[PDB]
Amino acid sequence: KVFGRCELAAAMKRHGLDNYRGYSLGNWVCAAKFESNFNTQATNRNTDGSTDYGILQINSRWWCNDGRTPGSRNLCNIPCSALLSSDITASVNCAKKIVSDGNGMNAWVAWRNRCKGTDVQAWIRGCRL
Numbered sequence: 647k648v649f650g651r652c653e654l655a656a657a658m659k660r661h662g663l664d665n666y667r668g669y670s671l672g673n674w675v676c677a678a679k680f681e682s683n684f685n686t687q688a689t690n691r692n693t694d695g696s697t698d699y700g701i702l703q704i705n706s707r708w709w710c711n712d713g714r715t716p717g718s719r720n721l722c723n724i725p726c727s728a729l730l731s732s733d734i735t736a737s738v739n740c741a742k743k744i745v746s747d748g749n750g751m752n753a754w755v756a757w758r759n760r761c762k763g764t765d766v767q768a769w770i771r772g773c774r775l
Protein backbone atom coordinates (compact mmCIF):
# COMPACT_ATOMS: atom_id res chain seq x y z
CA LYS A 647 0.00 0.00 0.00
CA VAL A 648 1.15 3.54 -0.86
CA PHE A 649 -0.29 5.92 1.76
CA GLY A 650 -1.14 9.51 1.23
CA ARG A 651 0.57 11.99 3.56
CA CYS A 652 -2.49 12.86 5.71
CA GLU A 653 -3.81 9.24 5.48
CA LEU A 654 -0.51 8.01 7.03
CA ALA A 655 -0.52 10.81 9.65
CA ALA A 656 -4.04 9.61 10.68
CA ALA A 657 -3.02 5.92 10.76
CA MET A 658 0.10 6.73 12.88
CA LYS A 659 -2.05 8.77 15.34
CA ARG A 660 -4.65 5.94 15.52
CA HIS A 661 -1.75 3.57 16.54
CA GLY A 662 -0.45 5.97 19.23
CA LEU A 663 2.73 7.17 17.50
CA ASP A 664 1.88 10.92 17.78
CA ASN A 665 4.25 12.44 20.44
CA TYR A 666 5.50 8.87 21.27
CA ARG A 667 8.81 9.38 23.18
CA GLY A 668 8.24 13.17 22.57
CA TYR A 669 8.35 12.89 18.74
CA SER A 670 5.52 14.86 17.12
CA LEU A 671 3.55 13.19 14.31
CA GLY A 672 5.31 15.31 11.60
CA ASN A 673 8.64 13.69 12.69
CA TRP A 674 7.16 10.21 12.02
CA VAL A 675 5.55 11.29 8.68
CA CYS A 676 8.84 12.92 7.53
CA ALA A 677 10.82 9.74 8.45
CA ALA A 678 8.31 7.55 6.58
CA LYS A 679 8.47 9.89 3.52
CA PHE A 680 12.28 9.61 3.16
CA GLU A 681 12.59 5.94 4.26
CA SER A 682 9.83 4.44 2.02
CA ASN A 683 7.99 7.26 0.12
CA PHE A 684 4.97 6.00 2.14
CA ASN A 685 5.08 2.52 0.50
CA THR A 686 4.47 -0.35 2.96
CA GLN A 687 6.12 -2.82 0.51
CA ALA A 688 9.49 -0.91 0.41
CA THR A 689 12.62 -3.15 0.86
CA ASN A 690 16.32 -2.20 0.68
CA ARG A 691 19.31 -4.58 0.99
CA ASN A 692 22.20 -3.23 3.13
CA THR A 693 25.91 -3.83 2.17
CA ASP A 694 26.23 -6.12 5.31
CA GLY A 695 23.43 -8.39 3.94
CA SER A 696 20.71 -7.17 6.39
CA THR A 697 17.47 -5.82 4.81
CA ASP A 698 15.26 -2.81 5.68
CA TYR A 699 11.47 -3.42 5.55
CA GLY A 700 8.31 -1.35 5.26
CA ILE A 701 7.17 2.26 5.76
CA LEU A 702 9.87 2.91 8.38
CA GLN A 703 12.61 0.65 6.79
CA ILE A 704 13.13 -1.45 9.95
CA ASN A 705 16.40 -3.49 9.75
CA SER A 706 16.67 -7.32 10.11
CA ARG A 707 20.07 -6.84 11.93
CA TRP A 708 18.19 -6.23 15.23
CA TRP A 709 14.42 -5.99 14.94
CA CYS A 710 12.79 -8.70 12.77
CA ASN A 711 13.53 -12.22 11.46
CA ASP A 712 14.00 -12.81 7.70
CA GLY A 713 16.08 -16.05 8.03
CA ARG A 714 18.93 -14.57 5.95
CA THR A 715 20.79 -12.14 8.28
CA PRO A 716 23.54 -14.17 10.07
CA GLY A 717 24.08 -13.30 13.73
CA SER A 718 20.98 -11.03 13.82
CA ARG A 719 18.35 -10.60 16.52
CA ASN A 720 14.54 -10.34 16.24
CA LEU A 721 13.79 -7.93 19.11
CA CYS A 722 10.27 -7.04 17.78
CA ASN A 723 9.45 -10.83 17.73
CA ILE A 724 7.99 -10.65 14.13
CA PRO A 725 8.80 -11.98 10.66
CA CYS A 726 10.19 -9.04 8.66
CA SER A 727 7.33 -9.78 6.15
CA ALA A 728 4.83 -8.41 8.77
CA LEU A 729 6.47 -4.98 8.26
CA LEU A 730 5.20 -4.97 4.60
CA SER A 731 1.48 -5.26 5.42
CA SER A 732 -1.14 -2.68 4.30
CA ASP A 733 -1.93 -2.57 8.10
CA ILE A 734 0.85 -0.52 9.80
CA THR A 735 0.26 -2.09 13.32
CA ALA A 736 3.50 -4.26 13.26
CA SER A 737 5.66 -1.37 11.92
CA VAL A 738 4.28 1.03 14.59
CA ASN A 739 4.70 -1.46 17.46
CA CYS A 740 8.29 -2.18 16.34
CA ALA A 741 9.14 1.55 15.80
CA LYS A 742 8.02 2.22 19.43
CA LYS A 743 10.64 -0.33 20.61
CA ILE A 744 13.34 1.15 18.31
CA VAL A 745 12.77 4.80 19.39
CA SER A 746 12.90 3.68 23.10
CA ASP A 747 16.35 1.98 22.49
CA GLY A 748 18.42 5.03 23.60
CA ASN A 749 19.19 7.24 20.52
CA GLY A 750 15.56 8.20 19.85
CA MET A 751 14.80 8.80 16.16
CA ASN A 752 18.55 9.02 15.29
CA ALA A 753 18.13 5.22 14.72
CA TRP A 754 16.61 6.30 11.37
CA VAL A 755 19.59 7.75 9.44
CA ALA A 756 17.13 9.36 6.88
CA TRP A 757 15.37 11.09 9.84
CA ARG A 758 18.70 12.44 11.22
CA ASN A 759 19.88 13.66 7.78
CA ARG A 760 16.56 14.95 6.29
CA CYS A 761 13.97 15.60 9.09
CA LYS A 762 15.83 16.44 12.32
CA GLY A 763 15.72 20.18 12.99
CA THR A 764 13.45 20.97 10.00
CA ASP A 765 9.87 22.34 9.98
CA VAL A 766 8.39 18.78 10.41
CA GLN A 767 4.88 20.23 11.19
CA ALA A 768 4.67 20.93 7.38
CA TRP A 769 4.23 17.14 7.03
CA ILE A 770 0.80 17.22 8.86
CA ARG A 771 -0.21 20.77 7.69
CA GLY A 772 -3.85 20.78 6.54
CA CYS A 773 -4.56 17.17 7.70
CA ARG A 774 -7.85 16.51 9.55
CA LEU A 775 -6.40 14.69 12.63
Ligand code: NA
Pocket residue numbers: 706707708709710711712715718719720
Ligand atom coordinates in the same frame (compact mmCIF):
# COMPACT_ATOMS: atom_id res chain seq x y z
NA1 NA B 1 16.99 -10.66 12.37
